[PDB]
Each structure stands twice: as C-alpha cells, then as structure tokens.
Amino acid sequence: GELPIAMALANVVPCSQWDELARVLVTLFDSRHLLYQLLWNMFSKEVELADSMQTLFRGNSLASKIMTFCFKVYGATYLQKLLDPLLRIVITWQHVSFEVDPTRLEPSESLEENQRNLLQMTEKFFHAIISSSSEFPPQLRSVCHCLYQVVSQRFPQNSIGAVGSAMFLRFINPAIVSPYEAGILDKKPPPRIERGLKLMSKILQSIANHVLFTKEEHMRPFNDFVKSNFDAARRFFLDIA
Amino acid sequence: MTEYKLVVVGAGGVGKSALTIQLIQNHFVDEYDPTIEDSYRKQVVIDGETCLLDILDTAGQEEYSAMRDQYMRTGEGFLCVFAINNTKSFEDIHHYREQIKRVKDSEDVPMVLVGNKCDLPSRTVDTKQAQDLARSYGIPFIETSAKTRQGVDDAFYTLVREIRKHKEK
Ligand SMILES: Nc1nc2c(ncn2[C@@H]2O[C@H](COP(=O)(O)OP(=O)(O)NP(=O)(O)O)[C@@H](O)[C@H]2O)c(=O)[nH]1
Ligand SMILES: [Cl-]
Ligand SMILES: [Mg+2]
C-alpha cells in the first residue's frame, strides 16, 4: 500500500517545494511501475475539488506540476525530434518578417505580407504536430489518457479540450517560445525569429483552447485560420486520448 | 507625448489579465484563459499629463519563465499582482521582485504591490501583511478588484507615478 502513505506525507510538504515533491513522487512511482496509479489519484483530486472546468488544471498546483514534469520527462526526445527539423528550416529563411502588430511595424515591411509568413509557418508547425501521432512516446499517451479518463468522469463534454489545451500550454508551446532553454536548439534564435515563434504559439494556443482572439486587436485577423483548424486539432487529441 | 512601459507580473490566475482588460476595454472577463504574452496600448490623462501606457500582460504559468528575462529588461515599471485569497501568490512575489532587481541591477526600481479579488469575502492574506511587505520594499500597495473595478485605475496610475519618481529629478 505505497500510494496511501505517499499521499498522506505529501500533505506535509509546503508550497515552496512542490517542484521537488513532484520530481520525487514521479521518479519514485515510475521505478515501481505505478505511475498510472499515482497520476490517477492526483488528477482525481484536482477534478473532484473544482467548482467548474474554467479553473481546473490552471495555475501551478501540485497535480499541475506533476503533469508538467511528466510531459517534460517522457516527451523530451519526442518534442526535439519533432520540432528540430522545423526550427532549422525557418532559421536558415530570406527576407521573412513576422511582426504583425501595426504599432511596431517597420515602414518598409508590409503588414498583409508579414501576416502571410506567420500563417505559413503556423501551418508547418501545426501540420507537423497533428501528423505526429505514430511517433508519440507510449508513456506520454498514458499520461494524456489518464487525464482524459479522469476529467470525463465529471466533465464528459469537455475532456478532449482539457487534454489538448494542457498539452499545448504546458508542453509544446513553452518549447516553441524558448527553444534554446528547452534543449531543442544549441543557440537562441535571432530576435526576428523569436518574435515569430512567440506570435505563433499564441495562434496554436487559440486552436487548442477552441476559442478565438478577442483581446489584442492585432491578433483578430488570424481568427479565420483558427476556426479552420479546430476540428483537425480535436481529431488529433481524440487519437492521443 | 511620453510613453510609460508598464509590465504586469504575478502567479497564474491572480487576475493580471482581468485588471488589464478592465482598463483597456472597460468590462470584466469571467473566462480563465491563461496568457502567454499580450500587449496593449492606451492613452490616458494622469495628473493633467496626457500620456501613453504601453502595457505588457505576462504569463503566470511557470512553464513560460524563460520569457521573463526579456520583458524585465524592456519594462520601466512593474505591477506585482497577487490574489488576497491565494497565499502562494503572496509568496511568489518574493521571487518576482528579486528577479527584477537581478536583471536591472538596481535595488530600487518602479514597482507597485497589488492585492486582487477584494470582492471575495474569504480572505487568506490580511491587509497588514501586504502593507508591511510593501514598506519593506519602499513601494506602494493597492487593493484591487477586477470584478468590481475597485482600485484598478488607482493601480496603474500609481505605477506611473512611481516611474516618475525613479527618473532623475
Ligand atoms: N472574483 C474575482 N475573480 C477575479 C478577479 N480577477 C480575476 N478573476 C478571475 O480569476 C480568473 C483568472 O483571471 P486572469 O485575469 O485570466 O488571471 P491571469 O493572472 O491573467 N492568469 P495567467 O497568469 O495564467 O495569464 C478568471 O476566472 C477571472 O474572472 C477579481 O477581482 N475577482
Ligand atoms: Cl487516499
Ligand atoms: Mg492572463
């Protein structure tokens, strides 16, 4: 009965050291082939204690930190082999520009042409992800399914969305925004590229969250691209879970 | 016209976006849509000076921490936000402030402490705890609520005033 004692002792650890706790819990229960049983308890204890789906895996709770740790530990080599060929193609790539904010646009550059280079890059990344189902590491599929199984107990009509937004917000998009810090590249990209990657991760997050741009005025023109990729994203998530 | 570069920082779910959107669009969002990095501009009048606010609404999710090093060099002032019903958000401001001083290499940099969700009756962070940490930092402290719009303008305007005080003379 290893799990009920680990759950009792986790109550004691204060909030300052939840990072080490998640690492210790996952390394401990995986080496005993019980990772799925740990994730089920932790994920169940944050779905049962949620008022609604709006506030569910948001923020950085202990269960959230365990989930992020798992994505980072079991998807590390999958994300690098998947994103590295695409990052090195847009880095090395002549006279491309990604600034789509009119307040920050250089006078020489065109807005309507800079919007098309962002969308062109977004397809290549988006299409690569939804076609990567067969290279998914198995440990990562069980993490995603366990989340899907737990959230469906109380929120069947939103389970597919929770898994997709979780994977994009805490796994894929962090890597795209800062590839050097995630180990994918060996050097920070040039500032023109870093700007595009950050803007693209915003577009991909909208598709995963199944919601359109309604805040920044300069991101609304991408709402048509976002609508046309909702279903393709839900089909990819339905496969992983 | 003068431009003030304000940055809003704090843990996830504290209400950083709801406060910014209340200033920019004059309405309260009840959606919890986690931010990556958002940029807004608004022209206001503050102590009779017409000026521009260049606001950067940052990400509270710790997975996006590699982005902090860049907006902390580019920003002039910082709104440090916590919710008064979440005590880990209060403990997280310690790390934010001591990572802004490390990046700017200054022990004094424009900054305002903000305690959000004062419309909520349940309160796990008393007012004396924040005022005492604010005096420890030589910075103001403003209680706000994005839901009722109480104190949101006071929050941004006091940050602008704190930026004016940090300018030589
Ligand atoms: N009752 C109440 N709820 C609030 C208040 N401010 C924000 N909220 C709620 O708190 C949730 C999170 O708000 P949000 O502004 O997105 O917080 P955030 O700091 O931007 N999150 P993130 O750092 O991930 O981008 C939403 O449900 C929002 O309605 C407030 O003053 N009162
Ligand atoms: Cl138990
Ligand atoms: Mg936000």
Side-chain angles (χ1 to χ4, degrees), chain A residues 1-36 38-50 52-71 73-92 96-111 114-115 117-241, chain B residues 1-106 108-125 127 129-164 166-168:
Chain A
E2 263 87 43
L3 203 80
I5 88 172
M7 297 296 282
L9 273 49
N11 275 284
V12 173
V13 183
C15 268
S16 65
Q17 309 210 231
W18 280 356
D19 278 338
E20 182 205 1
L21 181 53
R23 184 196 103 249
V24 170
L25 283 176
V26 175
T27 58
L28 224 35
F29 284 88
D30 187 29
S31 72
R32 301 165 160 78
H33 313 318
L34 289 180
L35 170 57
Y36 193 90
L38 170 71
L39 295 179
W40 182 273
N41 269 47
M42 302 285 323
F43 293 168
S44 321
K45 300 288 178 295
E46 187 139 323
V47 163
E48 197 221 358
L49 297 173
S52 148
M53 256 322 266
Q54 204 80 69
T55 56
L56 180 93
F57 287 119
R58 292 336 192 183
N60 299 112
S61 149
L62 174 57
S64 288
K65 296 202 172 183
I66 286 170
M67 186 204 307
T68 297
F69 183 83
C70 289
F71 287 142
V73 169
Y74 301 117
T77 66
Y78 151 88
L79 206 43
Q80 180 202 11
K81 168 212 41 58
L82 171 77
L83 286 176
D84 175 72
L86 287 111
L87 286 159
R88 290 195 206 280
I89 294 328
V90 298
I91 289 192
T92 87
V96 284
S97 190
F98 299 106
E99 197 54 72
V100 292
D101 189 0
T103 78
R104 301 165 34 94
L105 184 51
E106 218 72 62
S108 38
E109 297 181 23
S110 162
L111 176 73
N114 273 19
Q115 285 170 342
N117 302 128
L118 189 62
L119 284 194
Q120 172 178 11
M121 203 185 37
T122 306
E123 222 192 343
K124 294 198 187 283
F125 278 68
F126 179 70
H127 186 260
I129 293 169
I130 68 173
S131 318
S132 76
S133 154
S134 76
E135 300 292 305
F136 223 62
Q139 202 88 232
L140 256 205
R141 174 176 250 114
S142 88
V143 170
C144 284
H145 174 63
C146 174
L147 188 86
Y148 168 82
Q149 194 68 28
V150 154
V151 179
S152 35
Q153 276 182 7
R154 310 203 336 110
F155 296 98
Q157 70 285 0
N158 293 96
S159 324
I160 295 100
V163 180
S165 66
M167 216 206 310
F168 266 96
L169 169 73
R170 337 180 81 103
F171 178 42
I172 295 168
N173 270 334
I176 292 185
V177 169
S178 314
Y180 168 72
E181 286 83 341
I184 298 176
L185 296 187
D186 40 285
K187 185 185 55 230
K188 287 197 46 71
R192 287 174 100 128
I193 297 308
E194 292 197 72
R195 178 70 180 166
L197 296 180
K198 171 159 74 203
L199 288 174
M200 177 179 67
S201 80
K202 293 165 57 52
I203 302 187
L204 295 169
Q205 196 59 53
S206 272
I207 301 174
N209 294 349
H210 202 294
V211 67
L212 298 157
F213 284 117
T214 52
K215 300 203 278 212
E216 284 162 298
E217 281 312 310
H218 60 282
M219 298 295 293
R220 300 190 308 126
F222 305 109
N223 274 333
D224 267 0
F225 177 91
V226 173
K227 289 208 208 65
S228 84
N229 293 120
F230 280 164
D231 305 351
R234 272 187 77 269
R235 294 184 240 113
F236 167 72
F237 300 147
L238 257 169
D239 180 4
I240 302 300
Chain B
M1 185 168 312
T2 301
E3 170 183 322
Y4 295 100
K5 291 180 186 48
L6 320 185
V7 186
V8 178
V9 310
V14 160
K16 295 182 301 289
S17 297
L19 293 172
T20 304
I21 286 298
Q22 188 72 287
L23 178 62
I24 302 302
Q25 310 195 342
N26 310 289
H27 66 75
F28 175 69
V29 281
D30 227 328
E31 315 331 305
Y32 185 163
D33 172 44
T35 300
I36 290 173
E37 195 167 280
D38 296 348
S39 166
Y40 306 92
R41 289 183 111 224
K42 180 169 185 90
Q43 163 182 137
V44 289
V45 190
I46 291 174
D47 308 334
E49 156 177 283
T50 296
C51 63
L52 262 159
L53 301 189
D54 192 338
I55 299 180
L56 200 45
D57 174 32
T58 70
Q61 296 273 163
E62 301 173 5
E63 298 91 5
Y64 296 97
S65 62
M67 315 173 58
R68 295 183 191 156
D69 205 81
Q70 187 205 92
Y71 68 70
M72 293 183 284
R73 311 163 183 281
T74 204
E76 302 179 2
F78 299 83
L79 271 193
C80 309
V81 201
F82 69 103
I84 46 91
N85 70 338
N86 178 316
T87 47
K88 192 243 219 189
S89 64
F90 198 71
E91 291 185 1
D92 277 334
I93 297 167
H94 305 355
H95 309 329
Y96 269 116
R97 164 148 197 287
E98 317 274 347
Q99 185 191 0
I100 289 165
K101 291 191 313 208
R102 286 197 354 255
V103 156
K104 302 200 136 298
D105 198 15
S106 168
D108 168 272
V109 52
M111 209 167 312
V112 155
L113 183 62
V114 167
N116 201 31
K117 311 165 155 185
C118 291
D119 60 295
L120 294 183
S122 170
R123 189 183 186 116
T124 81
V125 189
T127 301
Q129 255 184 113
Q131 293 184 310
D132 270 309
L133 174 88
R135 271 182 277 98
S136 323
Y137 288 164
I139 69 170
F141 161 66
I142 310 296
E143 309 200 342
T144 70
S145 155
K147 191 179 182 178
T148 45
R149 175 162 201 158
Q150 161 189 82
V152 307
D153 297 275
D154 193 1
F156 284 100
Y157 291 22
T158 36
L159 178 54
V160 169
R161 297 187 187 104
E162 286 295 279
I163 285 173
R164 297 166 174 184
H166 170 269
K167 281 165 169 176
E168 270 224 68

